Design a protein around this ligand. Structure first.
Ligand SMILES: Nc1ccn([C@@H]2O[C@H](COP(=O)(O)OP(=O)(O)OP(=O)(O)O)[C@@H](O)[C@H]2O)c(=O)n1
Ligand SMILES: Nc1ccn([C@@H]2O[C@H](COP(=O)(O)OP(=O)(O)OP(=O)(O)O)[C@@H](O)[C@H]2O)c(=O)n1
Ligand SMILES: Nc1ccn([C@@H]2O[C@H](COP(=O)(O)OP(=O)(O)O)[C@@H](O)[C@H]2O)c(=O)n1
Ligand SMILES: Nc1ccn([C@@H]2O[C@H](COP(=O)(O)OP(=O)(O)O)[C@@H](O)[C@H]2O)c(=O)n1
Ligand SMILES: Nc1ccn([C@@H]2O[C@H](COP(=O)(O)OP(=O)(O)O)[C@@H](O)[C@H]2O)c(=O)n1
Ligand SMILES: Nc1ccn([C@@H]2O[C@H](COP(=O)(O)OP(=O)(O)O)[C@@H](O)[C@H]2O)c(=O)n1
Ligand SMILES: [Mg+2]
Ligand SMILES: [Mg+2]
Ligand SMILES: [Mg+2]
Ligand SMILES: [Mg+2]
Lengths: 134, 133, 134, 133, 133, 133
């Protein structure tokens, strides 16, 4: 019975898929524990959230993107919520994300892929603290 | 061009209809300006919010219900947002709410009716400042 | 807190709208109290069910139709279930049934209109007894 | 058993609502008789199509809009299609179009309203001639 | 061309997912041959149905749950109905069930997983004769 | 950034699944480059289109099918469209096509499977030439 950190990304807002995305998690019975809306995320939280990636080439365009529009940060709660919401998520790569998954059905880009989801018990605690210090 | 305040009531959470409702508003092309998730709204906001209903016979049951579960406060923005989002909502009486409207399709009870939405300009400014001070 | 009698009509089965129809009643929170599936309704129950119409011109083609395919007979239960399920139903006439309603969204014919719904407290008791003698 | 002409406006394409719109009409049992897709329509057909509004203040802006993106021209067939696809359509004015209708659900602007539908019999032949000569 | 037996479990009724499930099967083009609504399935059918599970540590909780609410028994018919409807269903382990499948999209629990479906020819003939003698 | 050719087979029209199919592709962000609707396709284009199967036992029945009702020819554009719309498609064989895919969800037959999609780059130009010369 864990908690994971989801991010709804600015492309979700541009393409009006915010409810479609949250709806897939909702219909699988995961409950919202906490949720915050950001018209524009502070770049600092974004740099924090993606620190493991700071060395990568895409890290800068990634950060630009994440602040280019609103985002919603949600904490969901369920049994094995971390691994299950990741399988809903789908693969980052638009050439490997299966139909049925969020990214497989809706996304078509390596960078603008609608959603972020914690991928581990440690990833979650840390990301959740970043977005929900309280 | 206006802003209106929307409440997603506890029954929406119980029935897993949060996305369904927010999606109906999203497709009509309204923008989220602000949004806050309340695992349990403090009672004194609920009585503030419904302060014009305090002399009514249902008031106390309404407050009890508005704290029985989570709620989401949202400020929406758009052309004639106030009155357009009211029509989407549908009348309060389940015997009146039109099919096609959120309450018309989804609600079956005079109290537990999923959604709130400001009815006027002064009402919205008032309610927005309650949930978003 | 009443009970009403719904019929899902053979055209619903032909056009695969059975789940779509039952889904609209389900999403409005009315509960299934009883339900029976008929691969072909006995013409007698059909003649009974529509007795008030026995004098009409359409009564014969109506009966043919109702037995031309399967039908499901359901009893739903809710507050004011009778009047509410009728407003979901929509108007018999394809020139007056509003969008949003079952018939307004899905039906296009005076005869083959997908669904039947009791229209009164007396209509219901009687129809329910016809389809559910027990 | 009529026929009618239906346009899917550039805002549908912009908003990914093409199937959403066509699906509502398909769902009602109306059938595609013919259908062309235009990446960008000759402005002549547009001024032709909307010739009856040529005097209106909005005529020039409306046409600029109609050539701002792709459009799809469809002929639909079925009993009473013209008047029936017209109630599916809903009111031009976003203050009167009902929930349940394409515009009531999906449109929120006086000009950008996703769909056009023949309003009468002669309107229907008139416009079908324009798009499918 | 086969027949397979499907159970809509009590949790489907609790969550208002009956139509959602039946619709997923309906769209894959399978036909209802028989169907019965059980406001409360008699326990001895449930133990019959799950008779190969009687030595398992979950058996008693499974029976308790299979009578906690209504269920619908359905015989479906179609080409390779048995194995096609099994894939639609998805694995039992929520950690295994694929997105796109009924359990993959909708279920979150090893027990309360919405749906049953015969796994083989002998299994279906057996289960069909239980619910439809 | 590829292009690909997609056909909506007569069974889609028969089953009212045209928007359902096109919607899934639109939803994935692929764009219509051009699109013709055929009430009934010249059998020549069909034998052309399926020229590679001309020897197969099924070739004759498959073509009879492809002219049994209307079809819609679409060119789609987007990054990696060919291979991407191919996984949306799913397996020809109703015993291997996964839930989540058009065929896995909607098709239940080896011949009548709703949609065709170019399988390679040259296949794509090849077929686009046929339908849009
Ligand atoms: N060339 C790339 C690769 C990836 N990304 C972004 O970097 C994010 C995180 O990287 P990655 O780990 O590869 O994707 P995730 O699926 O989110 O996996 P995780 O965060 O758990 O590592 C992706 O969501 C994507 O938006 C990017 O902008 N450009
Ligand atoms: N010319 C007609 C008129 C109606 N009917 C059928 O008769 C049924 C019942 O008649 P009507 O009462 O007009 O329609 P309902 O909307 O079902 O209203 P109710 O049964 O409550 O009277 C309709 O559902 C329709 O299928 C028909 O076959 N041919
Ligand atoms: N008899 C009533 C009437 C209203 N109510 C609740 O009180 C709220 C305010 O009522 P209202 O008449 O202003 O209805 P709306 O403004 O929400 O349409 C409604 O949304 C209902 O949820 C109730 O519990 N019992
Ligand atoms: N004030 C207006 C009114 C309409 N229009 C556009 O012009 C079209 C013709 O208006 P109309 O009154 O015939 O509306 P419909 O026929 O589309 O219902 C509308 O569909 C709008 O797209 C506009 O640009 N500005
Ligand atoms: N550990 C378990 C395993 C199964 N079950 C239930 O027992 C049923 C039979 O289990 P199964 O392994 O045959 O799963 P399916 O055949 O339903 O895929 C499952 O559908 C579950 O609902 C349970 O309650 N606890
Ligand atoms: N045994 C078969 C196999 C395929 N077909 C049809 O012929 C088409 C070509 O088969 P294919 O193996 O290239 O399948 P896809 O390319 O469509 O995935 C299929 O889409 C079927 O419609 C058939 O009629 N009989
Ligand atoms: Mg009020
Ligand atoms: Mg007009
Ligand atoms: Mg088993
Ligand atoms: Mg091939």
């Amino acid at each position: 019975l864990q908690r994971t950190l989801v991010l709804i990304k600015p492309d979700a807002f541009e393409r009006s898929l915010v409810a479609e995305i949250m709806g897939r998690i909702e219909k699988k019975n995961f409950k919202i524990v906490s949720m915050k809306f950001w018209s524009k995320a502070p770049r600092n939280l974004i740099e924090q959230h993606y620190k493991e990636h700071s060395e990568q080439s895409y890290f800068n365009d990634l950060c630009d993107f994440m602040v280019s529009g609103p985002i919603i940060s949600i904490v969901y709660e369920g049994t094995d919520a971390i691994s299950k919401i990741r399988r809903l998520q789908g693969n980052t790569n638009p050439l490997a994300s299966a139909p049925g998954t969020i990214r497989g059905d809706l996304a078509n880009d390596i960078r603008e892929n609608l959603i972020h989801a914690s991928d581990s018990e440690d990833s979650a605690v840390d990301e959740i603290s970043i977005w929900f210090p309280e």
